[PDB]
Amino acid sequence: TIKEMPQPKTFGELKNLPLLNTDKPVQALMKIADELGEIFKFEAPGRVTRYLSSQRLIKEACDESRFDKNLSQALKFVRDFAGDGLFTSWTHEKNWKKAHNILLPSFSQQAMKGYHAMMVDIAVQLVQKWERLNADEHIEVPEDMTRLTLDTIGLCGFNYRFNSFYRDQPHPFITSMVRALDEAMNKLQRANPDDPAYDENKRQFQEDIKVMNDLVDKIIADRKASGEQSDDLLTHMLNGKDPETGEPLDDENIRYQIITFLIAGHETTSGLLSFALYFLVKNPHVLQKAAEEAARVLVDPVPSYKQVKQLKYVGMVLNEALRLWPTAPAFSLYAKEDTVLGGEYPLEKGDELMVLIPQLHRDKTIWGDDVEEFRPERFENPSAIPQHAFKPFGNGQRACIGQQFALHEATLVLGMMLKHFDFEDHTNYELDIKETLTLKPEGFVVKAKSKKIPL
Ligand code: HEM
Ligand SMILES: CCCCCC/C=C\CCCCCCCC(=O)O
């Protein structure tokens, strides 16, 4: 039999839209998922899609033969400034595959070995900042993490120094980026977009998009006039040719790739580091574990690519935090052809599916009766994890291109942090997750007491 698609309350023409009227749509969806189960329909004026939570359905949606990446309404809005960069372009769009081939090289084992040096340059600035702090002062976690992350990707990928640590006030780019994301998020809940109330929001949107592009222009101009021979993402965007077409990326797309790597290559990571640290502080013994592991592997003042690969446990911390709170909370698919999801739900071609990643990682049938617990050990034997049970980095051909960059950076820094400081939850911070499409702990602050070890 065919099961009637379960779905939340409707408000006439508004459908389920009013349900999403909030600062935290994903978390709301999680609750609705909790109340409706493995799958439900969410309809709104014009659009309609199905949010999946269970692995059994996820594993199906994650079948390239039947489902390809769909641009969720969120991403459609992000396209306004991210254009057809990797993250926001359709699979069957010339620029995607092209850029994929052209840019992929910048994320190989060897490359990571080259980036590592610069990563440490930033990581040190961080430890330095935290070491230069005095008694009464405390650290603002996600603020400094984002500070770290943007600087790292900028240097590593474009050889441009945002110098985030040289400013107490948020780098302009960040400020405009968060606003553009936030607006993208707000548009999802809008009933009538043309309403002259949104006029202001639109003027501000353009404003922030322009600021982002202004930076791109500075990054490129800075590259032109420099003593080069840099083998980074930038030189690859500007020079690499897609071997399948022999053609290189056009300026319009190259721009899009810069914006894309600047945003995608920093936000999700800092969010990850913030959540990780949150959990470590809230789970002292796990912290203690990760602290010792670090203390013994990082024998050198400044960590090596290999020593970082030796930070087994801290990596587990990372995947656990990434399990409970996946920074990029969801990805979308579409029925490549008419089919039937789970043998119960009939899908027509082009039917949108939405994967609530944070829920998939709470599936007790996979993780057990304690899903809500921060237990790094769950990742002691990676082999145990059924595929499609842990999908924090997207799926298949359209998966995180920078995945390893993130984890290598996160591990490095998390390792160093635990190596040099005593972190105290001086405020018993209650978790508050701020949503800007991406997830991050807001107002998370701590105090780092020096172990007084140099670097
Ligand atoms: C913990 C951090 C990160 C998380 C959780 C994350 C997650 C993801 C996810 C879920 C997607 C797929 C979205 C979809 O299927 O619609 C994705 C795509 C992508 N990510 Fe990441 N990401 C992270 C870090 C990075 C970094 C550091 C870079 C680059 C330096 C990066 C670059 C990209 C790009 C370009 C894509 C588009 C891939 C494509 O569709 O061709 N990501 N990432
Ligand atoms: C290219 C720009 C960087 C990527 C920014 C967005 C990253 C991931 C998107 C997560 C979307 C989560 C959707 C929640 C909102 C909803 O479903 O209604």
Side-chain angles (χ1 to χ4, degrees):
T1 299
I2 289 180
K3 294 282 288 183
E4 189 181 295
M5 187 59 66
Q7 97 157 145
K9 277 305 195 195
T10 70
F11 305 73
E13 47 166 82
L14 290 314
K15 300 298 202 224
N16 311 104
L17 201 53
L19 292 171
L20 233 47
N21 166 9
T22 190
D23 260 348
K24 303 178 186 174
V26 172
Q27 282 161 280
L29 292 157
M30 288 188 42
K31 179 173 167 61
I32 301 188
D34 281 308
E35 177 203 350
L36 293 186
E38 57 167 34
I39 165 173
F40 66 96
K41 168 169 89 171
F42 199 93
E43 194 167 42
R47 64 142 168 146
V48 47
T49 179
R50 293 132 281 256
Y51 290 79
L52 284 48
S53 311
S54 57
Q55 188 275 8
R56 70 151 282 228
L57 272 325
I58 292 313
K59 74 172 173 75
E60 273 185 66
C62 287
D63 195 11
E64 225 123 58
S65 322
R66 303 168 62 197
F67 302 110
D68 185 56
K69 167 171 182 169
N70 169 39
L71 250 52
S72 52
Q73 191 64 84
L75 291 177
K76 298 267 194 68
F77 292 134
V78 175
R79 205 173 213 239
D80 288 333
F81 45 94
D84 60 355
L86 276 43
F87 210 112
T88 39
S89 43
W90 294 93
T91 310
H92 298 123
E93 207 167 15
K94 196 91 286 182
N95 285 121
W96 178 67
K97 189 48 181 286
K98 189 176 188 176
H100 180 298
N101 297 317
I102 304 180
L103 270 347
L104 173 59
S106 298
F107 290 103
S108 62
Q109 197 83 273
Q110 308 171 304
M112 283 308 120
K113 299 222 241 174
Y115 293 137
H116 184 297
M118 303 169 289
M119 285 184 185
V120 176
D121 176 289
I122 313 299
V124 167
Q125 282 192 44
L126 197 248
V127 170
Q128 307 253 71
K129 183 199 185 89
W130 291 1
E131 289 265 39
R132 295 200 210 281
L133 257 45
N134 35 241
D136 58 294
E137 296 178 329
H138 61 90
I139 84 184
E140 290 188 321
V141 186
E143 284 67 35
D144 283 347
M145 290 302 92
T146 280
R147 203 166 298 218
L148 164 108
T149 330
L150 176 60
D151 270 23
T152 305
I153 187 55
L155 199 74
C156 293
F158 308 88
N159 194 39
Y160 172 84
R161 288 187 178 264
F162 286 103
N163 271 347
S164 289
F165 293 107
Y166 284 78
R167 57 225 308 170
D168 66 314
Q169 290 312 300
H171 183 121
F173 182 77
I174 293 300
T175 307
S176 297
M177 174 205 55
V178 285
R179 275 207 284 264
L181 289 179
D182 189 77
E183 164 89 339
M185 192 186 82
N186 300 333
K187 289 183 185 174
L188 304 187
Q189 313 155 27
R190 280 172 194 177
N192 315 259
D194 309 275
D195 227 324
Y198 306 153
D199 273 348
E200 315 111 37
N201 308 237
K202 301 179 192 172
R203 187 213 91 231
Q204 176 69 73
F205 197 53
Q206 295 301 311
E207 186 172 299
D208 299 317
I209 283 184
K210 297 327 296 169
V211 184
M212 293 174 118
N213 276 279
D214 277 351
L215 182 86
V216 175
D217 306 338
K218 300 283 83 172
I219 285 176
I220 299 172
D222 175 76
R223 161 72 78 219
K224 286 274 78 196
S226 74
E228 67 155 64
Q229 295 305 74
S230 312
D231 212 55
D232 59 28
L233 224 145
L234 198 42
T235 33
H236 283 89
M237 298 191 287
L238 313 147
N239 305 146
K241 292 177 181 176
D242 174 19
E244 176 200 307
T245 53
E247 279 293 293
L249 299 177
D250 60 53
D251 291 273
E252 184 172 77
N253 184 268
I254 296 176
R255 171 231 310 220
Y256 286 141
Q257 302 301 347
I258 292 183
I259 281 178
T260 284
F261 283 81
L262 285 180
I263 307 183
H266 102 76
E267 186 69 337
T268 38
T269 313
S270 38
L272 171 59
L273 282 169
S274 306
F275 276 114
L277 182 48
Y278 166 75
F279 286 116
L280 298 195
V281 160
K282 292 288 180 175
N283 297 262
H285 298 125
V286 165
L287 200 174
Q288 187 177 90
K289 214 117 96 95
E292 281 181 37
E293 206 251 286
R296 70 162 168 261
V297 176
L298 313 177
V299 294
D300 293 340
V302 161
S304 69
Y305 186 91
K306 294 65 57 199
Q307 289 178 348
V308 173
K309 301 296 161 178
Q310 296 174 218
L311 291 178
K312 323 159 291 175
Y313 194 71
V314 322
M316 293 195 222
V317 173
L318 254 31
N319 288 285
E320 241 297 296
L322 213 60
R323 183 184 58 86
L324 274 312
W325 290 114
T327 63
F331 48 90
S332 176
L333 303 310
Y334 65 96
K336 187 58 189 176
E337 302 285 0
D338 293 49
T339 175
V340 180
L341 186 57
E344 307 167 77
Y345 313 98
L347 293 172
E348 286 204 75
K349 182 166 63 241
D351 263 1
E352 303 170 82
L353 274 56
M354 192 71 68
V355 173
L356 254 189
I357 314 178
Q359 283 286 100
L360 163 63
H361 300 180
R362 280 165 176 70
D363 192 4
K364 60 286 284 166
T365 72
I366 304 297
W367 307 89
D369 299 293
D370 65 275
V371 294
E372 207 73 43
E373 278 289 301
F374 188 74
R375 219 152 62 200
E377 299 79 21
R378 304 176 201 245
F379 297 84
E380 183 78 59
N381 181 31
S383 160
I385 289 65
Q387 226 302 291
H388 294 146
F390 182 62
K391 296 216 87 62
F393 291 116
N395 171 83
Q397 70 195 326
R398 311 288 334 254
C400 200
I401 310 294
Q403 171 177 176
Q404 181 80 347
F405 194 102
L407 273 27
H408 185 72
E409 176 175 12
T411 299
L412 168 56
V413 61
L414 234 201
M416 287 184 69
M417 283 172 31
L418 295 174
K419 166 182 172 186
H420 301 266
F421 301 102
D422 298 296
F423 298 97
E424 172 197 332
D425 186 355
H426 68 109
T427 53
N428 199 41
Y429 166 80
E430 167 45 11
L431 186 51
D432 181 345
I433 302 173
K434 175 185 163 91
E435 312 204 359
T436 43
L437 286 186
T438 72
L439 302 170
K440 205 165 71 169
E442 189 191 356
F444 172 25
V445 297
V446 302
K447 255 148 61 192
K449 289 319 170 198
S450 49
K451 274 192 172 181
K452 299 189 296 173
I453 304 176
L455 68 181

